[PDB]
Amino acid sequence: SPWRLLGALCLQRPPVVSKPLTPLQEEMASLLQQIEIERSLYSDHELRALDENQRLAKKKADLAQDLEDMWEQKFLQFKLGARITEADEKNDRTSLNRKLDRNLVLLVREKFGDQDVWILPQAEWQPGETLRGTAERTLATLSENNMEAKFLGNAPCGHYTFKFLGAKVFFFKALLLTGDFSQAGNKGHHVWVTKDELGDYLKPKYLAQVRRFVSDL
Amino acid sequence: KNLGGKSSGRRQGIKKMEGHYVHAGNIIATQRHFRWHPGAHVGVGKNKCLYALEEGIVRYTKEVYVPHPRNTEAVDLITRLPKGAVLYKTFVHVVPAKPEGTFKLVAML
Amino acid sequence: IPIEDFITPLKFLDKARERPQVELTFEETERRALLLKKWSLYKQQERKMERDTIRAMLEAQQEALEELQLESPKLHAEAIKRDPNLFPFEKEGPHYTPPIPNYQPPEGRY
Amino acid sequence: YKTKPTHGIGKYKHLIKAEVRAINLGTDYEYGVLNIHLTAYDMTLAESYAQYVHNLCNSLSIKVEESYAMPTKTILTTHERVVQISGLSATFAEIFLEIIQSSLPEGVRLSVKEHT
Amino acid sequence: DSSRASLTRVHRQAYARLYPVLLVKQDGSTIHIRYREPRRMLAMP
RNA sequence: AGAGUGUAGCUUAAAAGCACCCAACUUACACUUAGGAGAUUCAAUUGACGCUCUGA
Numbered sequence: 001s002p003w004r005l006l007g008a009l010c011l012q013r014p015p016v017v018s019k020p021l022t023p024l025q026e027e028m029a030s031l032l033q034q035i036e037i038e039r040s041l042y043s044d045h046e047l048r049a050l051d052e053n054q055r056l057a058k059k060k061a062d063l064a065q066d067l068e069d070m071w072e073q074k075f076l077q078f079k080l081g082a083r084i085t086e087a088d089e090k091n092d093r094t095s096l097n098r099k100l101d102r103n104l105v106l107l108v109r110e111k112f113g114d115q116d117v118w119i120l121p122q123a124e125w126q127p128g129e130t131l132r133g134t135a136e137r138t139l140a141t142l143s144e145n146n147m148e149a150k151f152l153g154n155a156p157c158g159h160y161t162f163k164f165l166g167a168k169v170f171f172f173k174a175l176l177l178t179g180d181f182s183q184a185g186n187k188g189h190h191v192w193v194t195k196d197e198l199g200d201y202l203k204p205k206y207l208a209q210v211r212r213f214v215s216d217l
Numbered sequence: 218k219n220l221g222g223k224s225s226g227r228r229q230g231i232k233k234m235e236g237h238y239v240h241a242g243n244i245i246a247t248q249r250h251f252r253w254h255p256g257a258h259v260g261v262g263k264n265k266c267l268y269a270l271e272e273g274i275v276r277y278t279k280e281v282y283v284p285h286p287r288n289t290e291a292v293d294l295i296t297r298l299p300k301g302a303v304l305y306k307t308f309v310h311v312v313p314a315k316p317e318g319t320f321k322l323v324a325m326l
Numbered sequence: 327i328p329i330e331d332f333i334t335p336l337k338f339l340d341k342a343r344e345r346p347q348v349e350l351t352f353e354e355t356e357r358r359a360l361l362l363k364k365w366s367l368y369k370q371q372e373r374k375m376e377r378d379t380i381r382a383m384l385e386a387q388q389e390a391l392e393e394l395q396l397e398s399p400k401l402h403a404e405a406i407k408r409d410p411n412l413f414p415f416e417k418e419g420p421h422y423t424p425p426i427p428n429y430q431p432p433e434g435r436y
Numbered sequence: 437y438k439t440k441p442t443h444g445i446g447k448y449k450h451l452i453k454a455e456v457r458a459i460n461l462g463t464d465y466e467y468g469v470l471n472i473h474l475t476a477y478d479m480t481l482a483e484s485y486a487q488y489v490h491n492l493c494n495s496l497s498i499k500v501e502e503s504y505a506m507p508t509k510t511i512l513t514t515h516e517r518v519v520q521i522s523g524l525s526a527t528f529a530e531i532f533l534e535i536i537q538s539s540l541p542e543g544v545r546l547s548v549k550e551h552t
Numbered sequence: 553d554s555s556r557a558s559l560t561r562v563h564r565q566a567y568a569r570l571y572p573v574l575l576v577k578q579d580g581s582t583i584h585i586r587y588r589e590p591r592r593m594l595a596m597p
Numbered sequence: 598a599g600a601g602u603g604u605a606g607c608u609u610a611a612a613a614g615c616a617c618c619c620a621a622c623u624u625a626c627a628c629u630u631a632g633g634a635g636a637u638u639c640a641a642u643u644g645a646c647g648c649u650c651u652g653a
C-alpha cells in the first residue's frame with residue numbers, strides 16, 4: 001500500500017510548581033497538624049519556652065520570645081517568587097512560563113497543500129532511520145533550539161490514521177529536563193496548552209482525542 | 218561403619234477398612250504421620266491413631282482441608298496457595314448404625 | 327552492612343509530662359469525623375481518575391502496537407526494545423517558585 | 437490410592453514455589469531488578485511516598501522484592517528509601533514511570549538506579 | 553496532583569514537634585520541610 | 598450513515614457477591630479491625646438517551 005510516512009511527538013513539560021490545595025485538603029492539612037502536635041513528645045523549643053518562663057517567674061517572685069521575633073522578620077524580609085507568573089501576561093502563549101502548575105505540550109501551526117491545520121509536531125520518516133530516531137530529530141528542526149528532551153521507551157502512545165494513498169501519524173512521548181529555547185518569539189505558532197485549549201485548537205476526530213493519552217493530573 | 222537401623226516394622230496402617238462394622242473404641246488406622254485425618258465419630262490419640270467413637274460402618278472420603286487458625290504452619294501454607302486452590306485430605310468416618318435408644322413402656326401408672 | 331536510623335532516640339523517654347491533656351468536646355470530634363469520611367470519598371475519586379488514565383492510555387498504547395503491528399511488521403519488533411538510557415534516571419519534583427533573580431546565595435553553613 | 441481415580445487429589449506442593457539480569461530474549465522484553473531511590477529531608481514525605489509506589493505496583497502486579505532504606509547523612513538529615521522493582525513490559529515501561537513522575541509531592545527526586 | 557503523598561503525619565511514637573520550616577536550597581527553591589525550632593526561612597550558599 | 602448493543606470495575610448475581618477508598622498496628626506491603634462510596638439509560642417483552650465499531 002502507498003503509505004505516507006509520518007512520525008510525530010507530543011512533548012511533556014513537567015510542572016515546576018506544585019498545585020494549590022483544595023478547601024477540604026486544607027482542613028485535612030490543619031487536622032493533620034493538630035493530631036501530630038497532640039502525639040509529639042516534648043520538643044526542645046517548648047522546653048525552652050515553657051520551663052524557662054516558670055523559672056523566670058521564680059526569680060522575680062522572690063528568653064525565647066525574642067528568638068521567635070527574629071524568625072518572623074526574615075520570613076517577611078526575603079520576599080517570595082511568584083507562583084503565578086500567568087495573570088500578568090495572559091497572552092504570551094509562547095512562553096515556557098505559560099503555566100507553572102500544569103502539564104504543557106508543544107503545539108504549532110502547519111499549512112498543507114489542501115489543509116490549514118493547527119498541528120501537534122510532526123515529521124516525515126524513512127525506514128532507514130529508527131522510529132525512536134525520528135522523534136529524536138523532531139527536537140531540533142521546527143523548534144530551532146538547544147533543548148534537552150527525555151524519552152522513556154520505544155513504544156508509541158497514540159495512533160490515529162487518516163487517508164486521502166494512505167497515511168498514519170505516530171504520537172510519541174518525551175519530557176524536557178531543561179531548555180535553551182532561543183528566540184522564543186519565533187516565526188512559528190507554538191502554544192503551550194494544558195488540557196482545555198487542546199479541545200480548542202485541534203477540532204477533527206483524529207485530533208480532538210490527543211487528550212486521551214496525556215497525563216490528566 | 219553403618220551401625221543401627223535394625224528397627225522392626227511398626228505394623229501401622231488400616232486395621233478396619235471400608236465398609237467394616239466397627240464398635241466404639243476400635244482402632245481404625247494407626248499411622249506415623251497424618252495420612253488419614255479423622256472425620257465423623259472418629260477420634261485421634263496422642264500417637265495420631267484413629268479410633269472410632271460410635272458403633273457403625275467405616276467410610277473413607279475426600280474433603281476440603283480447612284486447618285485451625287491457631288495452627289500457624291498450615292495457615293502459612295494456606296495463604297501461599299493461588300486463588301482457586303483447594304486442599305483435600307482423606308477423612309475416615311463412622312456412619313453410626315444403631316440409634317442411641319428407644320422409648321420403652323415402663324409401667325401404666 | 328545493616329546500619330539504620332529507625333532507632334528511637336534515648337532522650338524521648340524521660341520528660342513525658344508535657345501533654346497529659348488529651349480532650350476534645352463533642353462537636354470538635356463530630357467535625358473531624360465528618361472530615362475523615364469526606365476525605366475517604368475524596369481519595370477514592372482521585373484514584374478513580376488515575377485508574378482511568380492508566381487503563382485508557384494502555385488501551386491506546388496496546389492498540390498502537392496493534393496498529394504498528396499490522397501496518398509495519400519490521401517496525402513493531404523494534405518498538406518493544408528498551409532504551410539503555412534510563413539506567414541513570416533521576417528527576418526532581420515540583421516547587422513553589424521557579425528559582426529567582428540573579429543572586430544573594432548566602433548562609434555561613436556552620 | 438494409586439490405582440484409584442482419586443490419586444493425587446490431595447497433592448499441593450505443585451501449587452507452592454518453595455525454594456538477575458535484564459531479560460530481553462526474543463520479544464518478551466523486561467527489565468531486571470530495579471531500585472527506586474527517593475531522597476528528601478522530611479521523614480514524613482519520604483515514608484509516605486514509599487507507600488504509594490508500593491501501592492501503585494501492587495495494583496499493577498509488579499513484583500516488589502525489597503522496600504528497605506539506606507541511612508541518613510548529617511548535612512539536617514536526608515532520608516533515602518529504596519523500592520525494588522522487577523519486571524516491566526514494553527507498554528508498561530513509559531506508563532508506570534510517568535505516573536510516579538506525575539505524583540512527586542514536593543521536591544523529592546526519583547531514581548531508576550540498579551543493583552550493587 | 554503533587555498533593556498525593558504530602559498530606560502526611562509522623563508515623564512514629566517517640567518524636568518531637570516538627571514545624572513546617574520553609575527551606576531554600578541555593579537558588580530560590582522554597583520547599584516546606586518539617587524542622588525543629590521554627591525558622592520559616594532556611595538557606596544554604 | 599449503518600451494525601453491535603447497555604446492572605457501580607467485573608459478573609450463564611437476581612438490587613447480590615467480589616474487586617475498590619481512608620484511618621489505626623505494621624519501615625512498607627500483607628493480614629486484621631474500625632469506617633466509606635457506590636449502579637439496572639429514560640419511556641410502554643417493545644421503542645427512543647449513551648458507548649463501541651464499520652464509513653463519508
Ligand SMILES: [Mg+2]
Nearest residue numbers: 222223224225
Ligand atoms: Mg529399617
Ligand SMILES: [Mg+2]
Nearest residue numbers: 223224225226
Ligand atoms: Mg528386623
